[PDB]
């Protein structure tokens, strides 16, 4: 059921996705990204993303409305 639970999260991408860049991380599962819309946010991240991919200031995807790390 936990592996069925991981797959059902994945509707959140669905490709109308916008692109930001990763900046910093505060604590467990909460970080800061710099969007390509000019401004700067304080977002939440999914438990799915492997944490080895972080800090090159990586290119990241973001939600449109709710603006989280996806």
């Amino acid at each position: 059921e936990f592996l069925h639970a991981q797959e059902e999260v994945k509707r959140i991408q669905s490709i109308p996705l916008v692109i930001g860049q990763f900046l910093e991380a505060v604590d467990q599962n909460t970080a800061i990204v710099g969007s390509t819309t000019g401004s700067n946010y304080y977002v939440r991240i999914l438990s799915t993303i492997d944490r080895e991919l972080l800090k090159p200031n990586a290119s990241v995807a973001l939600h449109k409305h709710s603006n989280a790390l996806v």
Binding site: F2, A5, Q6, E8, V9, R11, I12, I32, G38, S39, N40, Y41, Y42, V43, R44, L46, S47, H63, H65, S66, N67, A68, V70
Partner: protein, 50 residues
């Protein structure tokens, strides 16, 4: 994980920099691009921590 799908359909938060605070539990913050705002503090934070 099952609860999580609603919580990330929820709006984010801005980040800004405190210039300096003033009286009556307010500060003065330029955000990133825009002007400076006189805003409210939370109930969990203190004025002296700013």
């Amino acid at each position: 994980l099952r609860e999580e799908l609603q919580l990330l359909q929820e709006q984010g938060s801005y980040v800004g920099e405190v210039v300096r605070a003033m009286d009556k539990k307010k500060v003065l913050v330029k955000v990133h691009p825009e002007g400076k705002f006189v805003v409210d503090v939370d109930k969990n934070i203190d004025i002296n921590d700013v």
